[PDB]
Design a protein around this ligand. Structure first.
Ligand SMILES: [Mg+2]
Ligand SMILES: [Mg+2]
Ligand SMILES: [Mg+2]
Ligand SMILES: [Mg+2]
Length: 66
RNA sequence: GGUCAAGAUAGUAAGGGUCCACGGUGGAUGCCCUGGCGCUGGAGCCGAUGAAGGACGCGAUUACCUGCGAAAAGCCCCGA
């Protein structure tokens, strides 16, 4: 989830959540390219999550150096 | 009436012409606005914190355009 769930965790946990998300996105690319990709949306959704992650760990890393 | 004779005149149009009817072509005309034009008034700088302008990308499907920039038709908080 966008706000809550992210900030509560460590910047070393972010790297992990990122990585796993990357991997799922690639799985979905293989599937899609082979067909069918029953749930397209998930792709975009995962994308968003990645963004959120990198936003948070950015924000936080600069708020802990405020 | 019939034969002959002398004389005169008609219709048929292969194609054309004038007019009428009915179409085709074509895009004038009328109506319209999603686009412009001028005037007045406002507002007036951007850039090494990387500009103006681009290239290549980002889409479930994406060639063009728009928006964006590997956090890629978008991510965070605030306000409506
Ligand atoms: Mg004829
Ligand atoms: Mg383009
Ligand atoms: Mg990056
Ligand atoms: Mg909001």
């Amino acid at each position: 989830m966008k706000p809550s769930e992210m900030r509560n965790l460590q910047a070393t946990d972010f790297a992990k959540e990122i990585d796993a998300r990357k991997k799922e996105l690639m799985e979905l690319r293989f599937q899609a390219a082979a067909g069918q990709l029953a749930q397209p949306h998930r792709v975009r959704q995962l994308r968003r999550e990645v963004a959120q992650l990198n936003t948070v760990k950015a924000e936080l890393a600069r708020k802990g150096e405020q």
